[PDB]
Subunit: 321 residues, 2 copies
Amino acid sequence: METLFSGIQPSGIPTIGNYIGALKQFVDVQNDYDCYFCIVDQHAITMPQDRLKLRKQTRQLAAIYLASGIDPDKATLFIQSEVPAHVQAGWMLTTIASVGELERMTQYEGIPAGLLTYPPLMAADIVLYNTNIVPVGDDQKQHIELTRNLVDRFNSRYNDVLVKPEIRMPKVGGRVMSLQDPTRKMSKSDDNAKNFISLLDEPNVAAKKIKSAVTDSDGIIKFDRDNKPGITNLISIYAGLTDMPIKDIEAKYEGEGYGKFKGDLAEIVKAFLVEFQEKYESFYNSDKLDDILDQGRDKAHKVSFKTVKKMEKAMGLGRKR
Amino acid sequence: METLFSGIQPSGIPTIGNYIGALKQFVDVQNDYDCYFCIVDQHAITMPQDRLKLRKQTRQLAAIYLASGIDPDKATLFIQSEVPAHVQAGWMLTTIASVGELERMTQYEGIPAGLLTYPPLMAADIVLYNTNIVPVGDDQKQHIELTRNLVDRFNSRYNDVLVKPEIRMPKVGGRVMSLQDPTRKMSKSDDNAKNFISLLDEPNVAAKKIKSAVTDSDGIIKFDRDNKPGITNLISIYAGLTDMPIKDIEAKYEGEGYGKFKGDLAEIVKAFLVEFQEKYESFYNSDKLDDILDQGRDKAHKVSFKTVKKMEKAMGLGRKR
Ligand SMILES: C[C@H]1c2c[nH]c3cccc(c23)S[C@H]1C(=O)O
Ligand SMILES: C[C@H]1c2c[nH]c3cccc(c23)S[C@H]1C(=O)O
């Protein structure tokens, strides 16, 4: 069984685009892959953070992953800073990186040193669990290249302990676009809040965002990205939240106009968020949330500890006991 | 009671200069100060190392400190990599350092990133124990300036948890010079091995190095650094290993020439090393050595854990449990 590792930034609420594109897919793929979901709070502080904003966002993310169906027994959901092997292995990989290498990553009061030195910590986050696949996008290519190059450098200079990972998302979800700019991907941090639908938006606000999404005044419910990216995007969201095949959507709405379809979809979005947010409140406001995160941390520590120990033996850190 | 922290590089055997200058003094000052002696193996790998050479040197250093009289109950002798708070607090301080700052430290395959990014780890090594004093020399000034500046930056941006340290050696020992270059300090890494006397030199080899030390052919046993740095240096070693006051040395050897004095001193050096190396073998070849280092690690972990936790709460890492 292949091991998957996904880093999660506690820096914002995922949108419904992120749910359809990734989270919903993770809820399936956790049965067929050994999955790690790591809330990378030590990466979040490479940037300036309010300390209450950061600690709250970390709980929020954990509650959202659990609300989506990420299962603490099937997968390992934990907080990066609670597992010390991450900064231990990150320091070891830092000593074999080069300054030139780290600088080129930054390209693809002063400048915080975290922004230069975080890539080896990302490498560590991955290889500590013998990861085979990382579900990232084009923007993370140079990071994985550095990771694989460091695994090569380590195994070559000391001895084979580390595994090279690949970029692979096992079941890619649909691509969800901004509601009022259908050529751009939906983003949690848009200045036009009508562009996205946050997982924590009020369900009635989200229904309004479906109605205000930029489309023709009317048309047929047909999937055509090149010529009608607006309605096509909406059909993608419909498909994403109901699992109805797209061709099966077209047939349900044959002879229907936009008003009927946007009305049904806004209701579908509202219904989804009401069910999602009840689960989310229930995890977020519960004592069991700390129990779950405790157990996740213990799972990850058991695996990552063995790896750190092999690494320390390979470089000659510590003692032979 | 003031807390003292001394980093120890596992990169070479201390010389008798290092014993007279520092180690012997630490054996006294550990009664009057809360002392931490930390074998910084995570700093040693910033440079290229053979992994067996490094792990052996680490045991050797611990055995030498114990052989000198460093007392595992009075002081805390441990190995840096066995206490995870060091790289945890080092990462936190890294995120508030600036690249410019770290670069200027480097001034005062490529260039290993460890050589750029180690100073915040040094800062962490110190402040984790609420250190008041660090017994370092001129070459470490910019490192302590960075440390104090990071303590200021941390306490100012989040809230007061960290203590500013000072450079202070509570009882400075004598200065011991190279035996065949009396104007340079004695160094463990000289290309002229007659220049130093290693604590692990064969006692008969060391006696020969006393005889081969570069002096006038004869003279009076008088302390005069400007005009007779050779014999004066030797008198310093004599004073350092026997605790005889220097004026009291001059009076013992009034009416004596160099041959008598160098003969007595070579015997004194031989006698000291025989007693030292028996203790050293006895710790180095013992199962109790791992027990001692275990207990040291547990002592340091208890203090440094509380500090790391205050730091994580201050930046908003982790969870409030
Ligand atoms: C969250 C970040 C991160 C830190 N460690 C990891 C490990 C795997 C994937 C990612 C990460 S994804 C990456 C990003 O920049 O999105
Ligand atoms: C061993 C080095 C080191 C790492 N952490 C610390 C903490 C205090 C003093 C020192 C150190 S002394 C320094 C040196 O360069 O000698």
